[PDB]
Design a protein around this nucleic acid. Structure first.
Lengths: 211, 122, 316, 316, 131, 133, 131
DNA sequence: GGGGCGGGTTTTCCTCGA
């Protein structure tokens, strides 16, 4: 199980609107993170024949684990929800085993935007390594699933709804999955939460929780 | 919660200035302020209007249990605003609240317009 | 590809308005958080959206293309960039709708041949068999630099009156003066190339012949954006712009420069260009820098003086 | 197109006013961002709005059109430029409102054959079928030069009394002194040409016949702006004006001369004009320079003496 | 000793305000963002107090509030005011300017105290006239 | 700083001249100066007043214990006795101060503000001792 | 070099004042509104210095203040004074007169410096006599 | 032998209208 870390510098922020008034999300979903990685290999093409229907040139990277977190302060504003965090820093962790270290590192440098066109984001540095699996009590900053238990004080937790990769195809809505975000609503920031969990990969001290 | 008492005293100052000048322009500027500059400029200009009314003896403190009030004479109309005017410390603490959140200027403006409207209707 | 970071200085300006309240026209502002020794301060700072820049770029491209004889759509000849979106738009131009998924590519090519703006700008057609085309030019929001411990931007309200001989006439306009910075990306290599898998359809030879002219026109259209021909309210509130710093990078692989929010952002982007070329096995990497505020540049860069030389070198 | 940059020196000035406080009449002030050796600073400086300049230009155009026999609107005959915005103006002039979109062009022509002011300065009608026409002359705020570290401008208040034999009469007036600069643009290739897209409508032949006279009048009207006939409070506060530097460029392609903020803004704009003509595939580019302060100009540049010669050359 | 200095500066500002009947100097002091603005007010208020001293309209006194407290009597426009406390020394002005060179917050603290002193005295004087 | 020491010694000279002459006019002129001419004229006129006080033995340098000895200037005026603590400026202090004024007239305002503070504190203390006696 | 010339003229005026015990020439110099008044003082002060030189009551010397500095010793009425610095050259007088023909301000500057030199020396001499 | 004294300002008005 290989892992990679990337540091991104945002220009003005990101904007992803909720499916189904156009409120937006607080942090990008894993689908956007996987699509940004896939942009490095599928550049120039917008429709691929999956075999039955044209849905996206991203239905092949669906099994790559990804998380992300903030490192600065921002504000969420509706004026079409937007998350303004100019000159901020984003840390993205990719955990997978499908490809070797070289391919993941090459695709990691090829991230251009997160969300829509205006949300450009440069790349400052990357790290690649081998991760270890643990199950003891850990402290994490990355968001995780709803079913994961919590031992600490419930004070900085929010509930959001994301979608699986089934939504990659047009004319079809993805499955609803609940997610827990350790975020302060105003001003925007990230806080540490202690969880027990069952699977946690150590990617340099900042344990990443998946289930 | 003295924050609400400070906002109420600022709203009384704005209402007295509006009733005396017969102009909403300072309250409009205060309620639309997006910077500490705009708020502070209105706080000076409204107090300068109130100072002229004090010097002319057209603005005076009174009691009306007895409640503190401000009598305002403008264009032969008599108005009475119930409450205290802000202290220098209230202005300073209010400016600190504005440096944290300009929302408090909108809250004071909404209260000031409500006071002035109720008095003009009566 | 081509990437650019540009720094601007604008005074007494009102280009991007927002919803009017009462008798007042308001400017577009966004919240920022500034760090102080005491703590944090939330401040509202004027901004300019990325849609007006796209509109100006598309209008300039239309004006340049109609001079060289390149095809231009009927509704795009008029400055109404609805593009081939719904059936009513297709009815005026005279294009049959796509039959099924397998024919989709063909439709694209037909559209790609009947309107240059639909190619470079990109288009989306909603319906039973949607077709997509991502824009070849990417622009970002114009936000003044958050450098140091002070924000160099202001916003005031101005009072205006109209004169009449029979009074029975008052309005307010918000004006600003800031120090703006913005970045952009363009991919001249993908111009005149379809973006759908399948088998080649008759008519691609015309696109191959027109590729060079379309690329030249797309590069030329950047002059209007880099010269300051965007926004509105220029009849009575014409602004006063000026160029301070500019970095443009031309490569053969994805790359972007650092945001122009710090006082030293050219040395960093040059070092990162070298490092990225080292890892991505690139061949071409060139940087052009225009400096007017006297900030540190570095070594290994050609220094220009104006924007016209930049366009000439990019075209060459 | 005709694009110009002009520098003026004005002393003991008050032509533009704002809301008054007490017995004090205030002068318009705006924030400006200026660059010094220590970084960037924000200052408050007196300015003059461009709407006064537009009003003076339109009044001079009205006078010239009336003298030369060109048609002038009934309301515009009096110096009240409400144009055709409201329904009362239409009722007074006697023009029927547009019925649908397809009739809009006709309405525009009816407005365009009655008042030259609507043709040159544009107009707006709001209703079921809105009609728009952008102004053909573009101006901006009058800002003093932001040269060096010290702004060459000053503002003060003055004391005045009214005499009376039976006291029962005191006011203050703001007076400023500065070195102002401003730029203007005028595209004469679109004068007397309809802007709304549609089919041919009877009455365009008269517009084609009168196009030359309308262009000549529009060019002549710039003399008032270039001479100094603008602003209010001229009865008792007549200012002292003196031209210092002027650059005028005539091109067949879009172009913008450098603002008159730096001491060297003529050589730069001439070089930029040459390179822009080279790169944009133009066919006409001429420059005229009036200099009275002994600053660098360049080589191969026509040098004039007064403004009337420039107006005659532009007309010819 | 910092609080005593701030209190003596606040007494000077309150005396200057009550004598001039103008809040403008206290407003400038409490809104100061530089040592320049603070120092300019410290001069201008002392210049106003100097005129009141020369006219014998400002004088130091003692008042029994059963021990004698130092006070400053101020006569303005036929109104009589009494501020309880000392005026600042030259050393207090110098030490206060050093405090301002470290943190302009102390000007806001002195301004808030000065306005409180003046408001309490003006309220008491208006009440006695109404009775 | 040496600049602050120079300004403090100029302020002592202005305070001595004010207490001896019983006139604020020279300090007012100094604190309102907008040119080197006005500053230099006051520096002469105040030293000319101090020179008369020296010749009359009404102005003298002394030391005072405030437990170490501090330099001071005793001033006798109209039967009042005042003591200003500190040194008077040297010729080099006047010359360096005039160079500071040629760069920024702000230093005249700073010296004037300090001089008025010294004089006010001394006048207040002298009036209080007379009221107690 | 302009400041050095002014300083040397100030030394000449201070030597002439200390030797004559009269401020009259320095007063005339500092109040001059014409080149005539300045030039007349430059002659009259040098004529006084010439008499002191002929009497050996004015002499050039060096003094250690640990390097040797140029100085002028002046003996007047049994008092001994020492002015530190050089006297002006003929070229300094000529260049100073050219400065005066441009701006009479330089006479006021030299007069202010001369009076400062003389006052400091007179104060030091009176203090040593009192001790 | 390096001056002295008496004077350091009094009224009147502090915006009108759309």
């Amino acid at each position: 199980m290989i892992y990679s870390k990337v540091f991104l510098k945002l220009h003005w922020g990101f904007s992803v609107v909720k499916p189904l008034a156009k409120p937006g999300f607080y942090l990008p979903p894993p689908t956007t993170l996987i699509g940004a990685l896939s942009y490095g290999k599928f550049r120039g093409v917008d429709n691929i024949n999956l075999g039955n229907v044209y849905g996206s040139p991203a239905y092949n990277f669906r099994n790559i684990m990804a998380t992300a977190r903030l490192e600065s302060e921002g504000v969420y504003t509706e004026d079409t929800g937007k998350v303004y965090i100019p000159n901020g820093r984003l840390v993205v962790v990719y955990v997978t085993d499908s490809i070797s270290k070289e391919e993941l590192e090459k695709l990691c440098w090829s991230i251009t935007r997160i969300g829509c066109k205006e949300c450009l984001a440069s790349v400052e540095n990357v790290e690649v390594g081998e991760a270890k699996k643990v199950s003891g009590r850990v402290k994490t900053r990355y968001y995780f699933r709803d079913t994961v238990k919590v031992v600490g004080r419930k004070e900085f937790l929010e509930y959001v709804t994301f979608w699986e990769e089934n939504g990659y195809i047009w004319g079809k809505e993805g499955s609803p999955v609940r997610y827990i975000l350790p975020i302060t609503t105003y001003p925007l920031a990230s806080k540490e939460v202690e969880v027990e969990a069952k699977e946690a990969y150590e990617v340099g001290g900042e344990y990443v929780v998946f289930s | 919660s003295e924050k609400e008492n400070i906002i109420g005293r600022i709203a009384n100052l704005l209402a007295v200035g509006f009733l005396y000048s017969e102009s909403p322009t300072l309250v409009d500027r205060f309620a639309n302020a997006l910077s500490k500059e705009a708020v502070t400029k209105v706080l000076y200009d409204v107090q300068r209007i109130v100072q002229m009314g004090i010097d002319r003896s057209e603005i005076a403190t009174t009691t009306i249990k007895d409640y503190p009030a401000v009598n305002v004479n403008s264009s032969g109309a008599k108005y009475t605003v119930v409450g205290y005017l802000p202290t220098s410390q209230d202005i300073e603490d209010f400016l600190r609240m504005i440096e944290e959140d300009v929302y408090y200027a909108r809250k004071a403006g909404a209260l000031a317009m409500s006071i002035a409207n109720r008095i003009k209707l009566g | 590809m081509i990437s650019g970071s540009v720094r601007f200085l604008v005074n007494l300006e009102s280009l991007n308005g927002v919803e009017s309240i009462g008798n007042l026209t308001k400017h577009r502002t966004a919240p920022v958080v500034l760090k102080t020794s005491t703590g944090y301060l939330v401040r509202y700072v004027p901004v300019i959206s990325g849609e007006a820049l796209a509109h100006a770029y598309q209008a300039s491209l239309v004006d340049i293309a109609k001079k060289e004889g390149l095809p231009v759509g009927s509704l795009s000849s008029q400055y109404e960039f609805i593009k081939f979106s719904t059936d009513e738009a297709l009815k005026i131009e005279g294009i049959k709708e796509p039959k099924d998924y397998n024919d989709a590519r063909r439709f694209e090519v037909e559209v790609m041949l009947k309107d240059v703006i639909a190619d470079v700008g990109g288009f989306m057609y909603a319906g039973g068999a949607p077709v997509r085309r991502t824009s070849r030019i990417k622009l970002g929001y114009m936000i003044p630099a958050l450098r140091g411990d002070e924000i160099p931007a202001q916003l005031e309200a101005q009072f205006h009156v109209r004169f009449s001989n029979k009074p029975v006439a008052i309005f307010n306009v918000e004006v600003s003066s800031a120090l703006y910075t913005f970045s952009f990306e363009l991919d001249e290599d993908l111009i005149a190339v379809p973006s759908t898998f399948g088998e080649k359809v008759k008519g691609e030879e015309e696109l191959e012949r027109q590729k060079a002219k379309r690329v030249k026109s797309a590069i030329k259209a950047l002059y209007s954006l880099l010269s300051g021909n965007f926004g509105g309210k220029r009849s009575r509130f014409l602004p006063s712009m000026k160029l301070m710093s500019l970095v443009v990078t031309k490569t053969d692989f994805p790359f972007m420069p650092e945001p122009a929010h710090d006082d030293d952002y050219i040395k960093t982007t040059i070092m990162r260009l070298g490092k990225a070329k080292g890892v991505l096995n690139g061949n071409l990497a060139k940087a052009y820098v225009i400096n007017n505020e006297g900030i540190e540049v570095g070594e290994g860069v050609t220094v220009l003086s104006t924007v016209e030389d930049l366009v000439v070198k990019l075209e060459e």
